[PDB]
Design a protein around this ligand. Structure first.
Ligand SMILES: Nc1ncnc2c1ncn2[C@@H]1O[C@H](COP(=O)(O)OP(=O)(O)O)[C@@H](O)[C@H]1O
Ligand SMILES: Nc1ncnc2c1ncn2[C@@H]1O[C@H](COP(=O)(O)OP(=O)(O)O)[C@@H](O)[C@H]1O
Ligand SMILES: Nc1ncnc2c1ncn2[C@@H]1O[C@H](COP(=O)(O)OP(=O)(O)O)[C@@H](O)[C@H]1O
Ligand SMILES: Nc1ncnc2c1ncn2[C@@H]1O[C@H](COP(=O)(O)OP(=O)(O)O)[C@@H](O)[C@H]1O
Lengths: 211, 211, 211, 211
């Protein structure tokens, strides 16, 4: 207590939407963040505040957000470490529209189960070993790219060039190799209701005190 | 009731040894086959009795046991179909040392959970849909070949030539594509105790009547 | 004489742009189609004229152009067969904007070398064996999808949904397996100038009569 | 002059047997090493002389010969560097039966073409860029393992355990990623006569002074 489930996989592999489904099925959606027993935590809350020079390149499409270094791993490891110790933590909120954290900060009170979703959430030895259960959402790259593209019409040519030069390699070099640390691999994502139901059942067991 | 879990994956991927582990952890080993609630059933019990001409080629290394046609799919589908209906079934025993069934025949009484392990156990639509949960033991081919080789010193040159000409293609053509039907993928095999424990817990839940 | 080089690979893998480069380097661009010794021939000239009902689905994004059946294989095989016999052929021109052939028709006079580029140009045994040399442009799917997308802004949501439901499977089922027939595999495409130069040199040798 | 062709690929992928075929077809076999114009050079001549403690582990199956560090890269780079400068070099001979170099040493006189075959022959930037043409023999791991096994009956259990714990990872980590540097990929190996003939023709062109 608390039971950490880590969920990795590529960008647009289905991590977020799977975790949401698990919160939805557990009914934890119908509850305010202070009252929850199961809570999702996203690694992408822990992006580093970019410098002038970094934000510069970020505008000109020339900055890599899929590299380990892109993430404030210390803040991350320290947060987790406190969550694990049963403490209330304040987590930041990143804005991709400005490439920086919001003034305000999310409180997360102790949970029984923590779903920790992120592209590089199994990259570091120290963090890997904190998880009781390790899930990897396996979704082919071309499928993921199509999801990501359609999801980012909120300009093509920047998005696509940024993918091929920075994202594709970073994925292959840092993210894909950590799949070997997965305990269970979940093909597809939110269409794998049998897989989700299996995980929900397991979370139900923990909560009910049957495990 | 009864809950069918199908487990596929390559030869020497770890299906048998994983299923054994699950029986061991559930304690179902310490019980006689008539008394069991969880029971393993192997597709490789359902190999066709070879003809003269077929057994001929089998000796001369020239017969393919990894092709769908190699299996008595009717007997198989009919057995399952009766198991599902809650009936006691008689299953055959194949002898690779003679390439034929033994005179005697194994009785399998109703179980609550049935673990059904086989290389092509998700090949046919009619059989796939019978399973409540579908597991695929993902173990790389070179690892599997090493297991199979070491496991078959009971002559190299026949085994290896038989692999490259008949087994490698049959695996790739018929077996590997059915991975897409897996609900949960289990990397490694019997070294994935977190995965096994998750499945055992789930089987425990069914048995206890918590699901 | 004439020397057939077949070039396959995925959509947007680089087949067309590689073949163009080879024509450019051989200088065959600076020559009218009647005067050429090296000529490119695209399988996508041989799409079937769609019916009313087929064109219907084509509009509603619901028709598969990456299936073997999508191509007029008879016309194709017959054309090739005549090219091989040293004859002048008339080839059709397809319009994706109307999903039908143009009234007019391209004449192709005997060449010494024929570059035959297509997604399924190694699918059929009868056609495979006509090629003296078989090239496969290997470019990862996510890279290809990005090329195809950017190349088809001439609407996202139709293009992307059409890819995932029809193109991704057809590629994997029919196209990717024919890579095993490739003699030489060319990673990347038009950025592989060493590979192209090797092929150009070889074409130069044939032409010069050094082979 | 001299034209370096580098050939990489896994152990038992077919590098050696392909290079031999190219020497055989060029007729360079029928010539003494001092008289040759085309010469093969194997990276596995450049293994480090093991220490007491290293040879110890080598006996007890516990030493990794597929790691970059396993090779005397300085000697290697220096040899190549001199070959490239048109000089006669002395190359060592390694004995796996004793894990050390032989007293005597092979002289290699200037060649016009040098075929340089090795598992990690594209690993280092400095060495990669020396090659005019870069070939990668792509042969699936299970096929390679079967070749290697049958080839090393000159004890199973040591060979197989040594593969899974040391060779499989080293291959995946160091060797397989360098495939991206290949100019041309040759599937299969010595059964790809069309590929070999293409390379032989090219070597013939260089020699004849047609390139
Ligand atoms: N079956 C599916 N599973 C998961 N995501 C899907 C599916 N179908 C479409 N999508 C879309 O793909 C994207 C997946 O990204 P998401 O799971 O939210 O982030 P990540 O995978 O990086 O955690 C979303 O925009 C989602 O709506
Ligand atoms: N970690 C492992 N998981 C599974 N099998 C292993 C493992 N390590 C060694 N083995 C051996 O590999 C072989 C696996 O074959 P098995 O699982 O019994 O058949 P199949 O995989 O065809 O169902 C066995 O001989 C087993 O002892
Ligand atoms: N290095 C490259 N090689 C090949 N095509 C490239 C490259 N970089 C960008 N492209 C673009 O990708 C697309 C490749 O498609 P093309 O080769 O013309 O068709 P196909 O690959 O289906 O034969 C083109 O739009 C081309 O301009
Ligand atoms: N078609 C083939 N191509 C290459 N090697 C083959 C083939 N068929 C069998 N073999 C055997 O596989 C092994 C390949 O190893 P080799 O090419 O000599 O070393 P490496 O691939 O490490 O350079 C050899 O023992 C060879 O006889």
């Amino acid at each position: 207590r608390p039971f950490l489930i880590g969920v990795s996989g590529g960008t647009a592999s289905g991590k977020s939407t799977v975790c949401e489904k698990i919160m939805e099925l557990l009914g934890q959606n119908e509850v305010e963040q202070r009252q929850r027993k199961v809570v999702i935590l996203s690694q992408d809350r822990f992006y580093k505040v970019l410098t002038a020079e970094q934000k510069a390149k970020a505008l000109k499409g020339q900055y890599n957000f899929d590299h380990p270094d892109a993430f404030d791993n210390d803040l991350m490891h320290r947060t987790l470490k406190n969550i694990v110790e049963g403490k209330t933590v304040e987590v930041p909120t990143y804005d991709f529209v400005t490439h920086s954290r919001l003034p305000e900060t999310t409180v997360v009170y102790p949970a029984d189960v923590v779903l920790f979703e992120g592209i590089l959430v199994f990259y570091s030895q120290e963090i890997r070993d904190m998880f009781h259960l390790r899930l990897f959402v396996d979704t082919d790259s071309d499928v993921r790219l199509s999801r990501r593209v359609l999801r980012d019409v909120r300009d093509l040519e920047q998005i696509l060039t940024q993918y091929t030069t920075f994202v594709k390699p970073a994925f292959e070099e840092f993210c894909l190799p950590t799949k070997k640390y997965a305990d269970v691999i979940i093909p597809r994502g939110v269409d794998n209701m049998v897989a989700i139901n299996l995980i929900v059942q397991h979370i139900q067991d923990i909560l009910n005190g049957d495990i």
